[PDB]
Amino acid sequence: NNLYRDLAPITESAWAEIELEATRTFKRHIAGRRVVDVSGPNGPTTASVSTGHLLDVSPPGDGVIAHLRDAKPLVRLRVPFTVARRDIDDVERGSQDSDWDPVKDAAKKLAFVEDRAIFEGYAAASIEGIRSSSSNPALALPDDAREIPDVIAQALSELRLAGVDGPYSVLLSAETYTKVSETTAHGYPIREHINRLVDGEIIWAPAIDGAFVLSTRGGDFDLQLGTDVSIGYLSHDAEVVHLYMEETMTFLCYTAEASVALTP
Amino acid sequence: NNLYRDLAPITESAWAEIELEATRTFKRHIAGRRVVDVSGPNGPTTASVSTGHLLDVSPPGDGVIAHLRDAKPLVRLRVPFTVARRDIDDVERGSQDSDWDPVKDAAKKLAFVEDRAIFEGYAAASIEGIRSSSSNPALALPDDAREIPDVIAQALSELRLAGVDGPYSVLLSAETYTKVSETTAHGYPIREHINRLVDGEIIWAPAIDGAFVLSTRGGDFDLQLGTDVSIGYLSHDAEVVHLYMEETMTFLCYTAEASVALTP
Amino acid sequence: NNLYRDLAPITESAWAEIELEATRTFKRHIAGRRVVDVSGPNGPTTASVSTGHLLDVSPPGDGVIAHLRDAKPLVRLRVPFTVARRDIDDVERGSQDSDWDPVKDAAKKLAFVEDRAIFEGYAAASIEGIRSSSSNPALALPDDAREIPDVIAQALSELRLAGVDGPYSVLLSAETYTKVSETTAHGYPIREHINRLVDGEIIWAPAIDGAFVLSTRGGDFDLQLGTDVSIGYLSHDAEVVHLYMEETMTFLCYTAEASVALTP
C-alpha cells in the first residue's frame, strides 16, 4: 500500500512495539471519540461527505433551473517523526527499554489537532467547531475552583431548558482538570463535587481550552473518517528512519442546542 | 419519494404515455451517452466524485502537514413544463392523439443542456468540456461540404499519431449533418463519404457546435449520474398541471489526447 | 529477479496501470511483429543464435583442419524514464487520470528502435535489415500520392516474378500513410485504392522510412527474443522513481527475394 512499510529497515517486533506505543498514547490523549458518533473508515476513495443541501448556480440556458449539491471535504493530517536504527535493532536482541518518545510526541500532537478541530474549529478545512456551532449562551469559567460546579449546574439548566435529553458529560481542559483535582473540599476533590451532578462521565480534554457540557443521546455530532490513524515510511539513513502518523477526517455538528461551552 | 407523483391528478395510463414520449425523444436527441462511459446512478445521497488528488492547506499548528481531498460536485438540472388536464383525462376514454409537445420540448432541452455540458463545458459546475480539455490541436470545419472528409482524415492522423487506439467515432452538429446529408457526390452523400473512413459510427450531435472525432476504447470519458432522468410534480390547477424533468450529473475527461475538435 | 521491482515505492495497482499503458502503446506502434515470425523468449541465459555455417581458422598444428561455428549475438535495448511519486500515490485514492506520458514515450522509443533495426539494420549489432538484404531491385516512392498504387503493382510483379507465394502485405511509413489517407479519389482514399490490390493487410510502420511490400508465407524473417519487453527499477527519490523498459533481441533474414523496398 501507500505506506511503503515493506521498504523500511524495521523488524516485525519493532513495528509492533511502535504501533502499541502510539495507540496507547493516542487513546490516552483523545477525548472527542468518547462523546461523538464515529462513522467508521469508508476507504481511501472517500473524499467528501454529502450534506443533502442545494446551492443556487447560474443556469446553462433558458428554461433551466440549476442547483449544486453540497459536500464537506475531508482533510488529511500528517505528523512526521524520526526514529533511531539502534533502538530499532536492539529489540531483536530482547531489549525492552527502547526509546519511543518521538512516537509518543507525534501521537500526542495528532490527538491534540483532532480534538482541537472537533471542539474549536479548523476553518481552512471548512470545519466549524462545537463552540461556534453551539446556540446556547456561553459561560465563563470562574478563576477560583470552588464556583465551577455552580456554572456547570447553570449549563445543565440551559441544555435541559432547551429540551435535550440523554446522559450528560463534562469535558474539562488540562488546566481546569488539574485545578479541580488538586483543590479539595470537605475531604473530597472539587472534581468529585462536579461528578456528583451529571449522569455520564468526566473526561480529560487537554487539547481544548475551557470546559464543555454536552449530551450523549446520539445523532448530534459526527466524526467522519476516511482512513483511521496509520503509520508510514518516507525515507531512511544509516542512523535514522523518518516515519509519519496520518489520518483523514472531518467533523460535523447537527444539533446546536446539545452543548454548552465555558470559556477560561 | 420527493417526486410527489401520488398527489398529481394523472392516471397510470397518462403517466405511462408521458414517460414513453419523454424517453423516446431524449434517447433520440442524446449523443454523449453513446460515446462516453456511464457510471450508473449511485443514489440521491451521492453529491460529489473523488478525484484522488490533494490540495495544499494551512496547517492547524506546528509540526503538522495538512492536505485537502479533491472532489467534483454534482449539478442538478430541472426543466419545468405544463400539461393540460383535458389531454390527461382523454386518455382513459381510449384517446391516443393527446398532445405531449411540452413534454417533448422539455426532453429536448434537457438533452441539449447535458450534451452541451459534456462537449463544451459548464463552468459554474466546474465542468471542463472535451473541447477545452483536448490537447490535440483543433481544426476548422470548411464552409463547403466537399472538404470535410479531408479534415476528418487529418484529425484521425492527429489522434493516431498521438497513439490512441480503439474504434473511432465522428459526432456531427445539426447544421453540419444536414449539410453532409443534403450534399451528394458520385451518387452518394458526403455523409457516406465520411462514414467510409472510420471504423465506428456517425452520430448526431445537435446540441454541440462543430464536429468531434474521438476514440471509444474506454476509460477516457466518464458521465457520473447521481439520479437518472426523472419526472416530477410541483402543483396543479383546474386546467393544468406543472411538472419537471430532473437529472443530477457531472462529467469528467481523463485522457486529453483521445479527441479532436473541429470548430465552425 | 534482476528487475528489483520489490524495492520500488510503487503499489500493485500503479504497477498494473503502468504495464497496461506501456503494452497498449507498444502494440500500437509496433509493426514488424505482425509480418515476421517470432521465436519466443528462450530465457536470460540465451546470448546468441547459431547459423549453422563454418568459418576458416588457423589450425592448432599439422594435419588438423579447424573451423569456427558462426553465431549472431543478441543485443539488449534499455530505455530509461522517470515517474512521479504523486501520480503513483494518487492511484490508491481511486484516481484514474494519472499521467503516464513518459511511459508512453519510452514505449514508442523502444518500438521505433526495434522496427528500425528490423527494417533498416543496426550494424554494430551485426543486424542486416530487410532493405539491405533484399535482392529484388528497389523502387522510388512518387512524390504524388496518385501514382503509389502503380509502384506497388510493379513491386508485386517483381516478387511474383521471382517466384514467392503466400499472402502479400504492404507496410507504409507515417508520412506515406498520412498522404494516402488524406488524399482521396472517386470518393475513396488512395489507401483503399492500395488495399484493393493485395490479399493481406495494410500496416502502419512509423519507424521505417518509405514503404515495403513483402510475403508472409513464413520462414523468411525471424525475430529472435531472449527476453520480451520488461519494466524495471534503478533508483528513486523523495519525488520521482527511475525505471527502464528492456528487451533483448536480434533479427535474421533468410530469403532475400521475399520483399521489395520503396525509398522516399
Numbering used by the authors:
A (entry chain A), B (entry chain K), C (entry chain OA): 2 to 265
Any passages from the paper?
To investigate the assembly of the Enc{tdNfsB} construct in detail, we performed single-particle cryo-EM analysis of the purified capsids. The overall resolution of the encapsulin icosahedral shell was determined to be 2.22 Å based on the gold standard Fourier Shell Correlation (FSC) 0.143 threshold (ESI†). The calculated diameter of the shell was 24.0 nm, which correlates well with the expected solution hydrodynamic diameter and has a calculated internal volume of 3000 nm3. The crystal and cryo-EM structures of encapsulins from close homologs, have multiple openings in their capsid shells, including a threefold pore and an five-fold pore. The cryo-EM map in this area was ambiguous however and appears to be the superimposition of flexible states. To resolve this, the pentameric subunit was examined by 3-D classification and resulting volumes were refined using local refinement without symmetry constraints. This isolation a series of volumes that could be categorized as open, closed or uninterpretable. The open and closed particles were pooled and refined to yield complete, unambiguous maps (ESI†). The primary drive of this is a shift in the pore forming loop (measuring 3.84 Å between the displaced His188 alpha carbon, see attached movies M1 and M2). The underlying cause of this movement is unclear and may represent an equilibrium of states when resting at cellular pH or could be a result of different packing states within the particles stacks.
